[model samples]
Target: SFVEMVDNLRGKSGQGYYVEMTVGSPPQTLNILVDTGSSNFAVGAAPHPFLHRYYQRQLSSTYRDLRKGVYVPYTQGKWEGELGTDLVSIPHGPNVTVRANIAAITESDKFFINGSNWEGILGLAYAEIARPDDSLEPFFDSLVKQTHVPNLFSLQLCGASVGGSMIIGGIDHSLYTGSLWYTPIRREWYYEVIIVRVEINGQDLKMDCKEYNYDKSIVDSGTTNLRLPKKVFEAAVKSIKAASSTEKFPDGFWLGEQLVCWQAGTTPWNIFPVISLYLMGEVTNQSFRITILPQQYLRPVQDDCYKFAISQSSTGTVMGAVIMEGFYVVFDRARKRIGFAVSACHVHDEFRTAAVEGPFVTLDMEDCGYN
Candidate 1:
């Protein structure tokens, strides 16, 4: 059997220190962002254009500056900052914690999001610098490098219902139920295998996973929605139409908020249902059932009977936040495997009536006070 490395997160918002290296041995800890959706980790430093009100500057002389090699450009805007290597501390398994080489970014104003909780994005994706020596792995890589443990992480998103904790490290035995369904990797860090096809309601639908030519169909635990290409979106809509009979909604399907309108109809559509995602991967064959939010199907339109398909757009189709409910997802940065497990669904404040979406599970953890 293929070994899919799994890492688990303990905190709902897993913990990581914030810091910048000007030129020295010891790095400073500043507030940082632990985002499972993104890869690579950098921080806000002094002398930058945009600064956060909670921004704190590192005064340690050990700040090693890499102003020349570090350039981060996001879709929203471009950020220029300095990068230097420093010591970083993060939890290993549960009670165990480890420290490894961390790349620090300075320049507070360069890239900062106002009103957001964290300061910078601490990416858990595979490191871009791992070449001749795999030690150059990203933040998550560094931790895996030192521990020599399974290269995996699991995220159980509790949502607002209970204000869940984001667990990082290894899978918590108590939180899981069934065997893990492992998927192999085409890319080094991220699972970018092609989505060859999608089967809905026992029906094969022609999806654009191949036409879109996307190198990677990322399975992100951090992202709230499933992102589909225009072609796949259209195919999905067609499949949903096959299951639905109403014609007045025009939008094809309705979400929870709009479910009231369907009350008058003969067969009401399920706002949130379990849908399977088919893909081609290394370890396992390309077919898997991943739950998704039916909210997208609820978009109101003029005619209810006409089929409305999701088209390929530059923005990419999002699976959406409602998709994750009772599944436990594993993120293994080292071997590059993402495992999924079906468990007893835990309903919190958000969805008391509807079955939640995706592989987002809730965990009970001690709150860290930071809202």
Candidate 2:
């Protein structure tokens, strides 16, 4: 096994985490957003109304015209493109030239954001959710196979300013501490997990565990917030409010539409509570728990206030970047499992300073993603 290092992942947590990649023959430099929520290694092929950059096929000597149409719909936007292939390499990553499938976008709606930061999305999710079916292999799989690396990959998204990293073939022990607890994947499409329950300040939500697993609980780096199902979200907000110092926040704050601020450089950390998840593991084996502190959910906005980094989701539990920043997560696709450990970026960070825990007694639960 080998480790292809990518430490230059950049972009605001709100916009999405992206890594700059060298694509095509002459190597056009482009910022490619890394997403585990979708499985299309798409690039901007033609110009769009809001986008400022494109792959410019004429410039690439080895670019292919697969001509297969691709239509990918996301939570916020959708894109229409043609399938193609091109040589891709990372100046600081895997030295292999991966002739990866590319969804060359020619038309799209509301897909590009921040206009200039990224021109493509590298969907790292499995092919089951891929457009046009699973025949189109995922780019990450291509990279792993071509390089003869292990099928496992890991990520340490240490917030925007701290840079970040992705290990393609192996795990970097230096990036994390404690044992990397593994959770069995119930689904093959998204890196979905099972939730036993949730806790705020170590106190259980006292609700049905099924409510926390209403739809699917996925660890998606593409998403920005820690979104929870309706019931779980309500309970979390209620508990946090019960512990709030001011005891009142703008209505929109809880809805994730508004920002709440204090004086510059000041945070109300003392009054906040730790949010945790009791994830179902191979408890034919045991179970593991993960926690996110106030800093993880209190994100700074452009206009000064710390945006509430949580939202209510009808789609089930989403462990997005907000919660992920506290730990280094692994997508151990080969073993049908995922792993997590405390990230080095939070070495000085402490509320409880315990982000990952587990192997507790397992409880019987319905399989949400398991077929």
Candidate 3:
């Protein structure tokens, strides 16, 4: 029998969530980042002594040294480590116990993971994109094979709150309302899905799929903001500016290509336009529209200040946490599909009310604090 384990995910403003898990025979606890963008389970990389809890391979009797070296480069930093395997476990189930390749970083470059309160990263993406070599599989991959676990996982990220859940092995229907909209995975490297069009304020941007030639966008939880192509981003900014007051952009204090701070005492919800992203459903050929409200786009920074959640990227556009936070996302590895539904954590009053109305059962958000 398979039982879903709801791991508590906690984070601060603008930072990613961390998963508390145990590794090795004696079960050494660690708080690792839940990253869907990359496929590498790494620890002991942070240079800060007080911040990072290094994985002591020597202490674990179950640990096995592969005698190989690994070097991985990420968007923000890089890590070099020695390859090894150990027993990895989480709450609500037996220890994975299987010997799986894990990395113990000996050196780190520009790694600010300690600042975010995460000691390590546990990649939830596909094995094809696994770092160092594609031969290495993620922790979950081995767990599913060894245990009676299902090849599925779901994520529920609340707004600005330190409470959420990462449900492994199955879906928790109680976390979301309505039917789950399913989309086929276009690529195995990332959770890349098919996006038909993008609309702002009821007007379609008419993005040429052939011209841009990239019809897919990765659904990543690790990324903080939405990254779009240059032309698309500029068009979105122009459309937003057209709907908003000119005074909002007077100071030109831009956070990035997508975000800007407007004048004080101005409500962006009343002035800015809403953005809609249309995705093609592989099973039904129907169009599913994911709407990003003005309030969702304009995030509060400090007193009388806010920033846009979107950003411009030269690389392919990615639908990150900014867009994902509004939905209950499910990644079905066995079926090679992705599912989305209205999340209870949605900022809208209607969603919050509906979530409390009974169909959605809230999971216990008890965090096993760092030891």
Give the least accurate 10-residue stretch of model 2, judged by summed lDDT: 362-371
Residue-level lDDT of model 1, residues 1-371, one tens digit each, is 01121222222211222222122234333445444544556655443334452223355444444434455554334444545554554332233334433344444332564433344566665654222224444666656666654566665543321232334556765555666655555466444443444556546564334443342355444343355565655666556655654444534232222222433242244533335554333332333444433432332222343112223334443332333334556666555666666533443224423231233221211110011
Q: Which numbered prediction scores highest in lDDT against the true structure?
A: 2
Off by over 4 Å in 1: 1-31, 46-57, 67-69, 75-78, 91-113, 129-137, 147-150, 161-167, 194-196, 208-213, 238-273, 279-287, 293-326, 343-371
* Candidate numbers, best TM-score first, in rank order: 2, 3, 1
How many residue pairs in model 1 have overlapping backbones?
A: 63
Indicate the residue-level lDDT of 40 in model 2: 89
Residue 233 lDDT, candidate 2, scale 0-100: 87
Prediction 1 TM-score vs. true:
0.63
For model 2, residues 13-92, the per-residue Cα lDDT tens digits are: 57887887878889998888889888989988887775677898888999998878989998779999999899998665
What are the C-alpha RMSDs, in order, of all predicted structures?
10.6, 2.2, 8.1
- Candidate 3: stretches off by over 4 Å: 1-7, 45-50, 92-97, 210-216, 250-266, 302-304, 349-371
Clashes of each: 63, 3, 0
Kindly list the per-residue Cα lDDT of model 3 for residues 1-371, writing each as its tens digit.
12344437887656788788777778778888888888888887334554557688778889888888998887667888988888887664443555567888888877645467777778888888887778888877887888877888888877664556788878877788877777667768878776665677779786564312143368888887787767777788888878875445642434454445446755546566777776556434355666777666566564356677777776667787767777788898888888888886776633222111112211221110011
State how far residue 178 of model 3 sits from its true place (Å): 1.2
Top candidate when judged by TM-score against the true structure: 2
